Write a protein that binds this ligand. Structure first.
Ligand SMILES: CC[C@H](C)[C@H]1O[C@]2(CC[C@@H]1C)C[C@@H]1C[C@@H](C/C=C(/C)[C@@H](O[C@H]3C[C@H](OC)[C@@H](O[C@H]4C[C@H](OC)[C@@H](O)[C@H](C)O4)[C@H](C)O3)[C@@H](C)/C=C\C=C3/CO[C@@H]4[C@H](O)C(C)=C[C@@H](C(=O)O1)[C@]34O)O2
Ligand SMILES: CC[C@H](C)[C@H]1O[C@]2(CC[C@@H]1C)C[C@@H]1C[C@@H](C/C=C(/C)[C@@H](O[C@H]3C[C@H](OC)[C@@H](O[C@H]4C[C@H](OC)[C@@H](O)[C@H](C)O4)[C@H](C)O3)[C@@H](C)/C=C\C=C3/CO[C@@H]4[C@H](O)C(C)=C[C@@H](C(=O)O1)[C@]34O)O2
Ligand SMILES: CC[C@H](C)[C@H]1O[C@]2(CC[C@@H]1C)C[C@@H]1C[C@@H](C/C=C(/C)[C@@H](O[C@H]3C[C@H](OC)[C@@H](O[C@H]4C[C@H](OC)[C@@H](O)[C@H](C)O4)[C@H](C)O3)[C@@H](C)/C=C\C=C3/CO[C@@H]4[C@H](O)C(C)=C[C@@H](C(=O)O1)[C@]34O)O2
Lengths: 361, 361, 361, 361, 361
């Protein structure tokens, strides 16, 4: 039997197929079992709130008309061009942008018709999937990225989408994310879309994403610590040298302000407080408190010099000078100890909150 | 009756349909009732002055020729490919950019023909809708975003567009906007476009948008307050220490200037004064006034030292030194009280103006 | 008479039309009268030197073959799809980028054939029109934006383009430009393109654009004034306090430099001096002159202290100290008066130059 | 003779043309003479290393089959749609990106068939041409931008490309470049591409571009001069005032550093030294040398005060104080004279190197 | 024999070819030998992690049906339009974005059919190839960029891809990369993709890229050295002048911080430490240590003045003053020597690590 005649015969104008009609019309719904292979993952953007993926979508459904018995070979892979009339099931992604096809050299498609009528349809597509991301704890957090595959134009009674029994989501070996870690466990759950038109089958997969803390520690946490240490250095400088201590406190407060403003620039304009805001707030409060401490010392010395040059004035001079010296001596010890207590408290609470988020999943 | 023959018969070359002609030609106008479902809303940009939406446009019109009585089933959902010849009514969005269709896997369309000839047409489209936004009160404001659906090429006598009686605009459950709040109430009003060619039916929907004030309070209002408090701290420093007080006043004025310039960078170049401009102007006036106050104190002490080293000169020395000390003492109390009075006045007026805008709608 | 047969008959294969041929071939030129309606105007970019417009281009020409007498109704609006063969006259925009068509829901076109053979053709198109803009006076200027409609492939003897007698350019009511004001008067003038191939008809419309000065006054002119006032404040500070006065002069000069550099960033790299350059140059000269004035005062006091500690030396001490005090006293009065004279001179000259540009048009 | 029949006859299915075959097959090569008209030139980007042009490509070749004698009129301009089968010669640009066609209103093409069989083909295209640009002398330089027109799929024996005898490159009158000057003289030279497949004809045109020095003088050269003059001002300030002189030297060095870093931001990351680097290096060396000079003066005065307060100590005090005073006195004269000598040397050498580049062409 | 009839005959409807079927069906696999010519290479982006190339892909395979003996000429180059039915083998790039074709003037393709049935197919395509790049040593590193050519829809038994025996990868002469150096040696290795669908042939080429160190030395290494030298200059200034030394140390630490933050902005957010981080960390530690050294000197002098003004107090005054003077004297020598030792250690280790990376390849 010539191959050309057989392939033509399946699509044969003489034969009745009428691609527009679904298989087993006025009957039980067509069941489509689909599994995606994730070729590339990346380009996650917090500001735009979307991530880009490249996937091989594979759809398996049974068509009775396409059954053939003339050829013993059951595999019978076919040319992708003659995919015009194999009743491609309509599918679309509920949350998407873009979703272009790949036309390079030849269309990236794979049509394979089994002997019993099972059809394997494989298409390569890049998806700009948009997923909302909670930025409550910006430094360390776990983001769930969800892709929904939903039918358009065929109701649930008409068409049903089911996740593949084995290997529904497959990740390419060696695929890595620079800013994130992809969890191996995957959530395969189906939610049925309800509209005024009717109920349409939909299935969705959830990808847990864990943000690596290596960059943020170096970029943000270590510099702020340096600025706070510089403000601590200001205590050892002489109280008499007012421009040096004042300028040092001012410069550290200004540096903390510009660093805090600059860090959060590459982020969406969310209205809720973040972990990074708490850290920046406390560190900026520390440097501001150091400047206030010098202002208090200078004012006490001013009162000393006021009583000095216009009665127990000598006693008052010793008291006020001892008072200022005492504030400096207590301050140099007290400031790092309090900062250490805050640092361990903040890290412990955020680590257990991260553990709680991992507990919830 | 075979399904293929029936579907072919409706579109049947043997039968007369002639898609180019509208239903009930040389007769009463075709009435189209349309309701949109908003799948995704976001990407609002003040600078570009546009917002992006993804919608399921649904159009219902009655075609007498498409009436069928052979099949008892009235629903009879059909394949979207055979939408070439169902007389799709021309519609376009009056204010748009882009407006691409979704071609992923299969075209996102839904053709449903009822027994009486009613046609349900549902298409998914992303619209870069451009709406002018009044930025009189930039911090807190209510923006109305308007989408117009207007016929092109068919006059009002020829074709009429009407909003659906029930559920004209439907918002997807759980849809949220990071920077804005979407009001539940919606304005459905039709305005008829008039041109030299003729009058064309148009209908429009207004979406009230309320801008959340959570981010702007943290990002802009709280830092400016910190700079003003730093300028107040400058009073407690000794009058003799001229570089410290001068440098502190200069640094705060410079910081206020760069913060004010940086904040308004992500905004269109509108010529009218905004609320944020008033707040930045007053706070910068406060820090500038603090620097002028120190300049006055230093000049009074200079006149004291002028009379000191070259008659009532001793009396003049006590007067001038008391005068400078008095200006400092009055200033430390006076500056925060005046700032508090301005702050409550500004918040009260802007809150009642916001209430007035909500009153107008 | 059935409508379908009549519409088919006009385009009838049986009848001779041959769309490729122009009307009244080997005869007088086809005369096309065209008027544009400006739906949206905006997105003007100085750096890119282009502006984006959305227009309804309407072309009216007379075709004798399309005359019909069978139907009394003269209007007879038709479906836009059957525009393949109505001899669309070739038109293109001489200075353009992009120029995409709008394909949303259905093609945005309007074909209307009159009884005598007059054809009304209306298409909606967005044009990235590029117009050179003179930036001699950047702050306040009038820019003329020109759109040219020129034939391609048909010579002047073959085809002629004429502006509509009434309402050649129509602007949508309520259309506004945030950064510019659009003048009501319009220049309709035709210039004939000459090439080695031949002479091709072209027509052009000029849109005068006036740049609003509200933003630039607040953003650029008011801060520079603040920096100059700060430099004036430096005079009242004591001459003995060298770090305070020196640092203040340095900071103001640096601030003026960074403000001048930052302002002109969003501008093309033109080689000619602008009004904003003159203003920045003079204000920066003022702050630089203030720093030089303090350097002179400090040097005179230095010479006093040189003569003081190693003859009329006492006389020289009084002279030099009086000299420095005199320079400060004269300087505090002299600097704002001179700046006021410059300010009124600059505003008067630029206002009359703006008036002269309005005089020229 | 009816026009429709004649035009149809040339493309006539009855007649043999077979568009796929080239003219005079198995014979001498087809000779194509092509001239381009440059409608718009601009959008040159140093970083991306490309420039965008809009051109009217005109190709003239002789086809014997298209000869006609039935009509006396030799011009016989034709509709651009029937360009499917006039054997368009394959041409492509060797160094390109984009290269989109213009589809606005109607395709921008011009087919003109002469009586002898000469075919004139004119297409409008925008080309993102990428040309490497030597940035040895960044401030003033001459860049050559080259466009190559090369055949694809037809060997040199099969097809030959030749530049038009008269007017090969035509520039639109009044076309101007904001940042560059276009030289009138043009290089028309053909280079034959050699591949393993075979030899393919190619022709190329070189556009000399001269960069205007007006902007760079104002933006970069004048500010650096201001910073150097400010460092010179530092000498007149008293040696005793250590914070003023130190802060002034620091601020000028920092300002020079940020200006040098900021200027070269809009440039590719080339590894070779540029003229602007030499200028920034020398000016920054001048301000750094001024700060070192003050450090030397302060150290000499320190040694004076060391010998002062713990033998010829008095003699040493006069020597050291005279030494510091001498360094200041010599420095104020010496620094501008040396800078003037460098400035004239740099301008003379770069001007003669520019002249040498113009000499080479 | 007429050429048209012969070309038509090969594609002849009368003859059996059936393009959908592969050559020698139900037989040994089709063997495709492919070599790419790299026309342009560049646009490497670290942040996006992709590079753009323009290539001439050439595929050679043998088709028995296309054998011809009627014409003696074996070359017989053909028109690219009749490439619809020459059984183009499906190929796609495993890691790609974009991959557009070039449609300018005519499609850029070359079909050449040999006498024995060998088919040469050459297409020009621009590929946005994405390759992960290890940034362990950011300053100097060697990056391997890999392009994979893999079959889609034909299994390994069905179709095999092989690299050309001679000249598999050809680079255009004179092609250069501004920021990188391309190694002449190339890795041609084939890896077979394994999927659940089956095994598909793939071949890949590796391009070693060496990053030039010329720019980074000037832009980053030389400024940091300048800041460290400025901090060394701070030692020569008098210990009594507390504002000058304090301000100088603060300014250098701040400058180092902003330079370090600014440099790494154009880089991906990787979590691992880089060479540039080590260099910035050490240099910033040096400037911070200089500021701590002045704080220690000032504190020792403070203790001297504490013992001075409220027993061996005189002895303590000489000891403490000598101690501070000793710290300054030792510090001025010690700091550059230690920095020199670090500099040679860092350069030696990174150079041998670069040599080790070149050793591994
Ligand atoms: C320690 C902080 C105080 C403020 C110190 O600051 C100073 C001086 C001494 C102070 C005590 C300044 C500080 C650096 C240190 C010098 C320390 C370096 C040798 C490095 O650091 C160590 C510590 C670091 O552990 C957080 C540790 O990371 C590991 C974590 C993980 O393995 C467990 C793993 O992921 C990976 C292997 O790496 C690692 C051993 O490297 C240096 C690499 C840190 C980067 C330095 C700079 C990079 O750009 C940063 C910032 O953009 C710039 C603005 C300021 C720099 C700075 O902030 O400078 C900066 O941060 O000295
Ligand atoms: C007056 C200048 C000196 C330097 C004064 O500076 C300071 C203190 C006092 C000095 C004398 C600083 C200056 C502001 C003033 C405070 C003045 C405010 C109340 C406002 O101003 C007035 C004057 C203004 O008339 C030019 C006038 O505009 C009209 C013009 C038109 O109607 C005729 C019309 O279009 C429209 C209605 O508005 C208007 C009544 O509002 C305030 C709104 C000005 C904006 C303030 C700031 C906005 O961001 C600017 C800049 O990005 C930032 C960097 C510095 C600010 C500043 O520069 O601060 C800034 O400019 O105090
Ligand atoms: C002269 C330099 C020293 C440093 C002077 O600096 C200061 C004070 C006095 C010092 C001696 C500062 C300096 C400006 C001058 C004031 C001079 C202005 C009146 C103008 O200048 C003159 C000189 C200029 O000739 C180079 C000359 O150009 C011609 C060249 C060509 O015709 C032969 C032709 O192409 C075209 C016609 O224009 C022209 C007559 O205009 C002013 C227009 C210069 C621009 C001023 C500023 C623009 O933004 C610049 C920079 O972004 C900012 C950061 C600092 C400013 C500055 O740097 O300020 C800045 O440059 O005063």
């Amino acid at each position: 039997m010539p191959p050309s005649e057989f392939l033509d015969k399946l699509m044969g104008k003489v034969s009745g197929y009428d691609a527009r009609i679904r298989p087993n019309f006025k009957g039980p719904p067509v069941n489509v079992t689909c599994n995606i292979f994730i070729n590339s993952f990346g380009s996650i953007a917090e500001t735009t709130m979307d991530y880009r993926v490249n996937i091989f979508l594979r759809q398996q459904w049974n068509d009775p008309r396409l059954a053939y018995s003339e050829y013993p070979d059951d595999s019978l892979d076919l040319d992708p061009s003659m995919l015009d009339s194999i009743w491609k099931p309509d599918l679309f992604f509920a949350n998407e942008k873009g979703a272009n096809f790949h036309e390079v050299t030849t269309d990236n498609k794979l049509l394979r018709i089994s002997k019993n009528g099972n059809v394997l349809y494989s298409i390569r597509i890049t998806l700009v999937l948009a997923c909302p991301m909670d930025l409550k704890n910006f430094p360390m957090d776990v983001q769930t990225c969800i892709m929904q595959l939903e039918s358009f134009g065929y109701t649930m009674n008409d068409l049903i989408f089911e996740w593949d029994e084995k290997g529904a989501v497959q990740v390419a070996d060696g695929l890595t994310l620079p800013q994130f870690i992809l969890k191996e466990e995957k959530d395969l759950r189906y939610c049925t879309k309800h509209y005024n038109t009717g109920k349409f089958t939909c299935i969705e997969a959830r990808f847990h994403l864990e943000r690596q803390m290596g960059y943020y520690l170096i970029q943000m946490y270590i510099p702020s610590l340096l600025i706070v240490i510089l403000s601590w250095v200001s205590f050892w400088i002489n109280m008499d040298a007012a421009p040096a201590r004042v300028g040092l406190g001012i410069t550290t407060v200004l540096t903390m302000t510009t660093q805090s403003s600059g860090s959060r620039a590459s982020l969406p304009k969310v209205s809720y407080v973040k972990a990074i805001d708490i850290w920046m707030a406390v560190c900026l409060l520390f440097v501001f408190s150091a400047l206030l401490e010098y202002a208090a010392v200078n004012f006490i010395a001013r009162q000393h010099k006021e009583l000095l040059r216009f009665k127990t004035v000598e006693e008052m001079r010793k008291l006020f000078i001892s008072r200022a010296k005492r504030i400096d001596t207590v301050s140099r010890v007290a400031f790092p100890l309090v900062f250490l207590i805050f640092n361990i408290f903040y890290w412990i609470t955020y680590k257990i909150i991260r553990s709680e988020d991992i507990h919830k999943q």
